[PDB]
Structure 1
Amino acid sequence: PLMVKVLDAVRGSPAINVAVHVFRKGLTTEEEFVEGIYKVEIDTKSYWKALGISPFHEHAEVVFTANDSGPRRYTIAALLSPYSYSTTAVVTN
């Protein structure tokens, strides 16, 4: 006998993010998993990954260069931060 109760009774006006998981029971492998439920990614970069089998196996001449030299402005008042009866703002002048 398994019983799960979440927020069974609520009165008012909340601000909520919820996540509920229940469970009874090659080069890159992944199995029987949960990922990236409330995930957030910003300026996330992956240059090389899982190129493959026998790459650049013989007499390979390679030049790898990576430049992230840029003017970038990321502004976020609230991130994964629910709020209630409050005040949020972003202002620039």
Structure 2
Amino acid sequence: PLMVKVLDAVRGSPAINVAVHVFRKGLTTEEEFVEGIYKVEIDTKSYWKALGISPFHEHAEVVFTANDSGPRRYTIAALLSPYSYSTTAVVT
């Protein structure tokens, strides 16, 4: 008998992020997985992935150049932070 009980009696007003999981039992392969339940990706780069079988196999002249040079600003006040009875502000 598997019994899982989470946050059953709540009185008041909290801030929650519940993640309950119960399990009873050619280049990239994945199986039976739970990924990115509460994930966050900011300014994330992937230039060359899984190009394929036999890419640039013979006599390949290639110049890979990657220039990440910029005036980019990211300002997050409450990233993944539940809060109760509080004050959150970004003042520029």
Question: Normalising TM by the smaller chain, what interval?
Answer: over 0.9
Q: In the TM superposition, what is the alpha-carbon distance from 1:15 to its structure 2 partner?
A: 0.3
TM-score, normalising length: structure 2: 0.99
What is residue 79 of structure 1 aligned with on the other side? 79
Q: Secondary structure at the match of 2:26?
A: coil
**Partner Cα separation in structure 1 for residue 72 and residue 61 of structure 2:** 33
Give per-residue Cα distances to partners, 1:29-50, cap 9 Å, x unaligned: 0000000000000000100000
Match of 2:42 in 1: 42
State the superposition RMSD in angstroms: 0.4
- Structure 2 unmatched runs, 5+: none
Q: Write the deviation string for residues 28-84 of structure 1: whole angstroms up to 9, x where unpaired.
A: 100000000000000001000000000000000000000110001000000000000
For residue 3 of structure 1, report the CA deviation from its aligned partner: 0.1
Runs of 4+ in 1 over 2 A off after TM superposition: none
Q: 1:27 deviation in Å?
A: 1.3
User: Which position in structure 1 is the counterpart of 2:88?
Assistant: 88
Point out where structure 1 has 5 or more consecutive residues left out of the alignment. Answer: none
Counterparts of 1:23 and 1:15, CA distance in 2: 26
Q: How many angstroms does 1:26 deviate by?
A: 2.1
1:55 aligns with 55
Instruction: Please identify which structure carries the higher strand content.
Output: 2
Q: Distance in 2 between matches of 1:33 and 1:76?
A: 30
Q: How far, CA to CA, are the matches of 1:65 and 1:18 in structure 2? A: 43
Aligned length in residues: 92
What residue is the counterpart of 1:4 in the other structure? 4
In 2, Cα distance between equivalents of 1:57 and 1:7 = 57
